[PDB]
Amino acid sequence: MMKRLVYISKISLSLEEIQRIGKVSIKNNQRDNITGVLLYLQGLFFQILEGENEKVDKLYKKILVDDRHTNILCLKTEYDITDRMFPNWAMKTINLNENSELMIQPIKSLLQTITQSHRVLEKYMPARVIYLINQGINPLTVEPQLVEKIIFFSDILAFSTLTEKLPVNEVVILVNRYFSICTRIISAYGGEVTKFIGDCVMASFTKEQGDAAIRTSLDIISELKQLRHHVEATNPLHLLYTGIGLSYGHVIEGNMGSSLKMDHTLLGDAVNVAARLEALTRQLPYALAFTAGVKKCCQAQWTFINLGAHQVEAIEVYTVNEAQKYYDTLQITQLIRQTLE
């Protein structure tokens, strides 16, 4: 059984260094009955690989960690190929920058144009769809799956007051900083941010990442606390606080929409509960609020704190002792408004 892979990447690199890739590739691909082509053009690599499923996969894992390229995207995988596309070529390297033949110029220009455009579109794609494509899965074909998820929601305290008083550029700087911190920490704990909705960050963890979701939440709150006293009191970042809600439930995860517009969405009750628990933190002495189901997913010896039943009928709300606000929330929102007067 044989498969064929095509990927693109960003060149990180001397002309003689690329020759060394060709040299080694030809040797290894001959031994392993792998065939294919490597092209390069205006700082991008294009490679097609084909051969026995297992030898191709071992090579691709190796290519994934090669530091001579970054931002690798496997565009297409074919699983039960009958013929090789390049049966004579262990690894043929083609420098398309070198080809100035007039009849190849249109195709060369179009490949560069469409691939650069493709690379821009990738930046707006959701991580989960990027993952599916990388795994050889048709996002337009795969069925959504019911999965057990911890939903994470966070947003900026008194964000309407920030947007009312601050210039547009300052708001953007602040929001970008907030999104950067949240995204880096969520991703470091193995979570996936799903969307930004206004100033809100929506993310998800698996049922085995209960403690990681609490740690992520506590780490975000901690980094904002550091940031607020790192900056001068006139920097808008001095005013940046967050609240976080977590929920746990069955959600349907997948690609939804029509041929006119697709998106990657999570469907289910847990989404709205986590959002509502996020909003509830504004009137709690804790910056983090979550459901009994989230507590059930935790293994670590947190000092859980029962905050009673709250209408979202009414459910129990929990937090942990580390999430206690060192401040009174209403005074902070008034202080935020006075600072920008």
Ligand X SMILES: Cc1cc2nc3c(=O)[nH]c(=O)nc-3n(C[C@H](O)[C@H](O)[C@H](O)COP(=O)(O)O)c2cc1C
Chain positions contacting ligand X, by CB under 6 A: 9, 21, 24-25, 28-29, 38, 45, 47, 49, 59, 62-63, 66, 68-69, 91
26 or 267: CB nearest Ca ion:
267
Between 292 and 331, how does the x/- string for binding to Cl ion read (CB under 5 A)? Answer: --------x-xx----------------xxx---------
- Helix, coil or strand: residue 198: coil
45 or 318: CB nearest ligand X:
45
Selection from Ca ion, a copy of itself, Cl ion, none that 142 binds (CB < 5 to 8 A by kind) is none
Measured CA to CA in angstroms, residue 17 lies from 43, 184, 191, 267 at distances of 14, 33, 37, 49
CB of 96 to Ca ion, least distance (A): 48
Selection from ligand X, Ca ion, a copy of itself, none that 66 binds (CB < 5 to 8 A by kind) is ligand X
Q: Pseudo-torsion of CA 317, 320, 326, 328, nearest 10°? A: 0
Strand partners, 50: 4, 35
Selection from Ca ion, ligand X, Cl ion, none that 155 binds (CB < 5 to 8 A by kind) is Ca ion
Selection from a copy of itself, ligand X, Ca ion, none that 317 binds (CB < 5 to 8 A by kind) is none
CB of 45 to ligand X, least distance (A): 4
- In the chain, the amino acid numbered 127 is A
- In the chain, the amino acid numbered 13 is L
Selection from Cl ion, ligand X, Ca ion, none that 321 binds (CB < 5 to 8 A by kind) is Cl ion
65 or 121: CB nearest a copy of itself:
121
CB of 202 to Cl ion, least distance (A): 7
CB of 50 to Cl ion, least distance (A): 38
271 or 297: CB nearest a copy of itself:
271
CA distance 216 to 205: 10
CA distance 94 to 270: 51
CB of 321 to Cl ion, least distance (A): 4
CA-nearest of 242, 264, 262 to 253 is: 264
The residue ranges that bind Ca ion (CB under 5 A) are: 155-156, 159, 199
> Which residues, other chains included, contact 202 with Cβ-Cβ below 8 Å and sequence gap of 6+?
151, 152, 153, 193, 194, 195, 196, 271, 275
Selection from Ca ion, Cl ion, ligand X, none that 300 binds (CB < 5 to 8 A by kind) is Cl ion
CB of 156 to a copy of itself, least distance (A): 10
Among 129, 266, 273, 336, binds Cl ion (CB under 5 A): 266
CA distance 265 to 190: 19
* Cβ-contact 241, 332 below 8 angstroms: yes
Interface with Cl ion in residues 116-145 (CB under 5 A): none
90 or 323: CB nearest Cl ion:
323
* Cβ-contact 188, 139 below 8 angstroms: no
Scanning the structure block, which residue is given the tokens 């609490």?
214
CB of 205 to Cl ion, least distance (A): 15
24 or 300: CB nearest Cl ion:
300
Sign of the alpha-carbon dihedral angle for 215, 221, 224, 225? negative
Selection from ligand X, a copy of itself, Cl ion, none that 222 binds (CB < 5 to 8 A by kind) is none
On the CB side of 160, CA atoms within 13 Å amount to 1
Pairing of strands 304-311, 314-320: antiparallel
For Cl ion, the binding residues (CB under 5 A) are: 265-266, 300, 302-303, 320-322
